[PDB]
């Protein structure tokens, strides 16, 4: 009979089965009437590579460096080191108003911008 | 060949165990405890046979009666089939009828 245990891949079926299965690559366009493949430039992941000419940070570390107690970053710590000083200053000055938290870094809805956080618009 | 070629390891038995030394204690508790407790209530074991001897068919019937509602499905199917078979055997087959 047929091999039940081997993983079903793109090499195994008839001619129609081949070419439909794929290997996990993500599509970058569509097929038109003449079987012509239209590529979309925006559907192709553009690699964001920085400049490394003046970058003094090697892929290893020196052994002479000293250890430190680990402390995973939390939302509370980020708030304390991000918004707490400014809001403390503008509350001590008496200008803090609870209604408009926007000028402290908060935003009501996440639809308006490009890199929205909860649905994770971006890639990586 | 069937016999072991060596002597089995010597099995020491502690006759003055806690359990062996205290075996039988608090028996006769009804006789000399003003019958507040029965010796059958010192028995530990299955819920369907504590203070009860019974046959094998009787044991199966009693187990299905007392604990057969919280049994596993395959175990209860096995019990039902065993009760059926035992009924047939003890009621239709054998000498002495």
């Amino acid at each position: 009979g047929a091999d039940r245990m081997s993983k079903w891949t793109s090499k195994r079926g008839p001619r129609s089965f081949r070419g439909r299965k794929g290997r996990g690559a993500k599509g970058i366009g569509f097929l038109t009437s003449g079987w012509r493949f239209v590529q979309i430039k925006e559907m192709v992941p553009e690699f964001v590579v920085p400049d490394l000419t003046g970058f003094k940070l090697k892929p290893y570390v020196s052994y002479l460096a000293p250890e430190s107690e680990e402390t995973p970053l939390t939302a509370a710590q980020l708030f304390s080191e991000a918004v707490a000083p400014a809001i403390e200053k503008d509350f001590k000055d008496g200008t803090f108003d609870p209604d408009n938290l926007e000028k402290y870094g908060f935003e009501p809805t996440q639809e308006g911008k490009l890199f929205q956080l909860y649905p994770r618009n971006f890639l990586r | 060949i069937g016999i072991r070629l060596t002597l089995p390891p010597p099995k020491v038995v502690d006759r003055w165990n806690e359990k062996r030394a205290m075996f039988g204690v608090y028996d006769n508790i009804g006789i000399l405890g003003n019958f507040e407790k029965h010796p059958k209530e010192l028995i530990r074991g299955p819920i369907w046979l504590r203070g009860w001897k019974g046959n094998e068919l009787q044991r199966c019937i009693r187990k299905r009666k007392m604990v057969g509602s919280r049994m596993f499905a395959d175990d209860l199917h096995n019990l039902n089939k065993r009760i059926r078979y035992l009924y047939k055997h003890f009621n239709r087959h054998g000498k002495f009828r």
């Binding site: 964001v48 920085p50 400049d51 003094k56 940070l57 090697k58 892929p59 290893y60 570390v61 020196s62 052994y63 002479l64 460096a65 000293p66 980020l78 080191e81 991000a82 918004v83 870094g105 908060f106 639809e111 490009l114 890199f115 929205q116 956080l117 649905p119 618009n121 971006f122 | -």
Partner: protein
């Protein structure tokens, strides 16, 4: 580096990843497990590098330094004391080079030694009120120190020089992070000056 051993695997004086250990215990092997005393991580006193005293064996009463600790079988290998002799260079026409080789010892077979009088002594783990946690002798009551041993890194930190691919301590510890409510994507976009003006639009998640 990450190899899982069978549930009943014998630890046999060779590392699990060694060729000799692979030869001795192939994946097809099944044999009766050795049952060892259960000792927690907070009462194992003898560490790799201290001097112990052998209570009994072929040599009883001689002092020695432990060279390897196998916690999976309660084993401490004493340096060149509880030894038997074997050949290492083996050919079909000449074999020689008989060497002494140590055999493992259980932890009741050895006892710890304190540097004052060089005598066997029992150790109790008394929690010091200064914060650290060390061993204490019973009969006399001294602080037996944790011995200094080379680490598993195979390095000495004092005679260490930075390589061409090792980042120095100063620029490895220099803090360049300023906490902010912006993601890595926004920060790199603005730092590298990538301008995106068209907006992402509503998508149906289900």
């Amino acid at each position: 580096s990450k190899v899982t051993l069978p549930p009943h695997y014998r630890y046999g004086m060779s590392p699990p990843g060694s060729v000799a250990d692979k030869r001795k215990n192939p994946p097809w092997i099944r044999r009766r497990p050795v049952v060892v005393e259960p000792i927690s991580d907070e009462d194992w006193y003898l560490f790799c590098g201290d001097t112990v005293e052998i209570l009994e064996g072929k040599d009883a009463g001689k002092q020695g330094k432990v060279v390897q600790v196998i916690r999976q079988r309660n084993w401490v290998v004493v340096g060149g004391l509880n030894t038997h002799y074997r050949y290492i260079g083996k050919t079909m026409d000449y074999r020689g080079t008989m060497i002494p080789s140590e055999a493992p010892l259980l932890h009741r077979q050895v006892k710890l030694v304190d540097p004052m009088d060089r005598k066997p002594t029992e150790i109790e783990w008394r929690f010091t009120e200064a914060g650290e946690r060390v061993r204490v002798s019973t009969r006399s009551g001294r602080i037996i120190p944790k011995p200094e041993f080379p680490r598993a890194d195979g390095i000495v930190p004092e005679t260490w020089i930075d390589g061409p691919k090792d980042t120095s301590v100063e620029d490895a510890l220099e803090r360049t992070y300023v906490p902010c409510l912006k993601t890595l994507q926004e920060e790199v976009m603005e730092a590298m000056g990538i301008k995106e003006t068209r907006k992402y639009k509503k998508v149906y998640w289900y």
